[PDB]
Design a protein around this ligand. Structure first.
Ligand SMILES: O=C(O)[C@@H]1O[C@@H](O[C@H]2[C@H](O)[C@H](O)[C@H](O[C@H]3[C@H](O)[C@H](O)[C@H](O[C@H]4[C@H](O)[C@H](O)[C@H](O)O[C@H]4C(=O)O)O[C@H]3C(=O)O)O[C@H]2C(=O)O)[C@@H](O)[C@@H](O)[C@@H]1O
Ligand SMILES: O=C(O)[C@@H]1O[C@@H](O[C@H]2[C@H](O)[C@H](O)[C@H](O[C@H]3[C@H](O)[C@H](O)[C@H](O[C@H]4[C@H](O)[C@H](O)[C@H](O)O[C@H]4C(=O)O)O[C@H]3C(=O)O)O[C@H]2C(=O)O)[C@@H](O)[C@@H](O)[C@@H]1O
Lengths: 379, 380
């Protein structure tokens, strides 16, 4: 498969078996084609579809509210907002791109993967429509920055913590490599998206917000580099991917994993089991890319000898029994998120206990959740 | 006497008295509240018709919301029919603007009407009136007097009345409209239109199939149904019906829901059992605010089966002290601050100084903008 943000091994196996006419896969792909129809008809979304504008006055600037910040009832204007870790302020849904970036990302991802497997031009054409409108359109496309992502009313300093929102559209950016060579994705479309991705990569690496997020001591730094790798892989910068793995990702794992394999930065969160898992999901998506060029982030040690497999080891019994978790978790943990994580970690590590547990937890055969498309093996 | 309505009339009268006498503590408190209220004077009045997606009637004046715990079924091609996940609010609810707009309207009308009652300044009646007219009686912007499409569920075949509980967000504003009667801005015509609207809503809640079913609910929905019923009846000055509902429906319903140890078994089975135990009692609390103004104390009056609502407070009191001690399912954190007004209301109605003391110890923030706390200087 082309370099991108997916399990390349599972995708190739699906395309092989679908082209071979294998019955199990052909039936699974035909279900996925029924799921995917809503995306062929779906009107492409745009970040410009908001009423309340950013401080730049530019509807093309992405802006969201940082989810745990709330009006202060003891202030006349509610300002400045105050933090309630783990309590999502429903005001976030007043920023349309919060859910629209997810909807776009789901649509482009599903369509791009279904085009790669089946070769049907109708999937590239619709995938292309979503990509053009979201990224490159001179009126509807988003500016390549995350300046106003997770803004906070009344906050005086700028932060880069909102960059983590980018994972919702950076996976779709990656899957665009899958429609290159279709009739619908012209050389001109590719150049524009290449140029947008080049400007976004530049902003990520050189803006102050980008630099600060690249140095975050918790799961934000890990997601920053996972996003970084999707952009770099889209741009075919294989040397930079190696450099990011060795100079940023591995040192981060070495610092954030304690000797017992816990992630202390996530243990202090009110949703500590969710955020431990979310840290590892960043590594999981990062590894999907690094493992396509021979770097296994699950088993490759940092300079201090720590390996991401130690973090999985620490959490595994709590994926078996979340009720055993001893740290603060003020909402129930969704065990299903462990399925893909334990499958990904298990195959990379040769740990059949992890792979077995992934299949016992399982994914629903008929689920329309787009990230589960490659994982027939769990269905 | 304050007009009959959905508030602690004793505290409101105390506030108006002291404010008019010029007592310093109250005058300063009311001047804070006037600063808080300023946003409501400037606020553009909201309307249920400010939606894009219409209800099956095709009428924008029909209130419509999504039942909050119903989610798309990802294993279905269309996500239909939705499935229930108790206690997990589907953010799709925020796609129905009247869900939050009913709250915002309710807050503004409540705050402004109470501030007019306390202070006598016409500017509060005038703004309160603007919000009431637009929400209720306006021939284009006012809501139709029904809750047919409240908490609808995609793909569900049966009609339900469970969405009626949404009405509490605007039924308190309806009640407070009595406080601006006699202002210059609230004309005789305004009163008649709202009287007529309230009559039609009372007819709908009592005679529609959805209203009848909700009136028979065996959990907190039945309690809130009667609390809402009382707000409407008190607005309409139907004191004989208030007595009848208190004696023939609320007290038997309340007695039926209290187990021998004072627990509320219907609420213990919920994923948010401490929230819904508290929510059941808040219904009784607001109902008692109306019944006690005509001599019926719902906290201390036993039902005919011998249960009394004070038993339910007794069961929950130690867990209001220490919410972490709660042993039943509570998949989100419980807000202890909700115990403050509840224990003060029950504590005063019962002469229980331990409840009142704890209420003041938990307390409310002196400067909070939460409009339901306006009468509770005593806790601030
Ligand atoms: O978008 C979502 O709704 C949600 O996103 C994922 O969780 C994210 C949040 O979006 C958000 O960015 C949050 O950031 C936290 C975090 O703790 C962050 O490191 C930083 O912490 C600050 C904070 O001010 C503290 O008080 C302390 O001083 O440390 C600071 C620091 O610099 O470390 O900011 C806060 C915050 O603003 O709340 O957590 C994110 C995360 O940790 O990834 C995720 O839950 C996802 O499922 C969901 O989609
Ligand atoms: O509006 C909110 O977001 C929220 O409202 C308050 O909680 C309300 C909910 O809005 C909702 O109506 C919910 O109804 C429950 C309840 O359990 C009810 O009895 C009924 O239950 C049905 C259901 O079919 C079950 O599957 C079972 O068969 O029992 C049935 C029964 O009739 O007993 O409907 C469900 C449901 O639709 O989810 O709970 C309400 C309540 O208990 O008052 C409240 O949380 C408030 O703070 C908040 O504003």
């Amino acid at each position: 498969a082309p370099l991108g943000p997916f399990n390349a091994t599972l995708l190739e196996q699906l395309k092989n078996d679908y082209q071979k006419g294998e019955k199990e896969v052909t039936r699974y792909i035909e279900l996925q084609e029924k799921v995917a129809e809503k995306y062929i008809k779906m009107t492409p979304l745009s970040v410009t579809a908001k009423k309340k504008l950013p401080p730049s006055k530019d509807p093309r600037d992405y802006m969201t509210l940082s989810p745990y910040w709330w009006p202060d009832s003891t202030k006349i204007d509610g300002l400045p907002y105050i933090r309630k870790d783990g309590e999502r302020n429903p005001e976030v849904y007043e920023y349309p791109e919060r859910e629209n970036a997810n909807r776009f990302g789901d649509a482009a991802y599903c369509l791009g993967v279904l085009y790669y497997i089946t070769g049907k031009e109708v999937y590239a054409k619709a995938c292309a429509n979503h990509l053009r409108t979201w990224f490159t359109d001179p009126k509807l496309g988003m500016n390549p920055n995350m300046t106003y992502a997770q803004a906070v009313p009344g906050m005086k300093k700028m932060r880069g913590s909102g960059f983590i929102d980018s994972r919702r559209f950076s996976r779709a950016l990656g899957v665009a490599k899958l429609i290159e060579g279709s009739k619908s994705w012209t050389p001109s479309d590719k150049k524009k998206l290449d140029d947008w991705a080049t400007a976004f990569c530049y902003w990520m690496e050189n803006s102050t917000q980008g630099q600060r997020e690249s140095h975050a001591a918790n799961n934000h730094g890990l997601w920053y580099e996972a996003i970084h790798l999707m952009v770099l892989a889209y741009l075919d910068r294989t040397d930079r991917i190696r450099e990011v793995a060795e100079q940023s990702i591995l040192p981060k794992m070495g610092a954030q994993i304690a000797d017992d394999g816990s992630l202390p930065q996530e243990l202090k969160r009110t949703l500590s089991l969710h955020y431990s898992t979310f840290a590892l999901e960043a590594l999981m998506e990062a590894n999907q890319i690094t493992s396509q060029i021979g770097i296994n982030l699950w088993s490759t040690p940092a300079s201090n000898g720590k390996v991401a497999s130690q973090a999985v080891d620490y959490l595994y019994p709590f994926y078996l029994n979340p009720e055993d978790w001893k740290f603060k978790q003020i909402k129930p943990f969704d065990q299903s998120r462990a399925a893909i994580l334990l499958y990904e970690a298990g195959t990379a590590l040769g740990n059949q206990k992890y792979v077995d547990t992934a299949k016992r937890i399982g994914l629903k055969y008929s689920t329309s959740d787009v990230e589960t498309i490659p994982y027939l093996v769990l269905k």
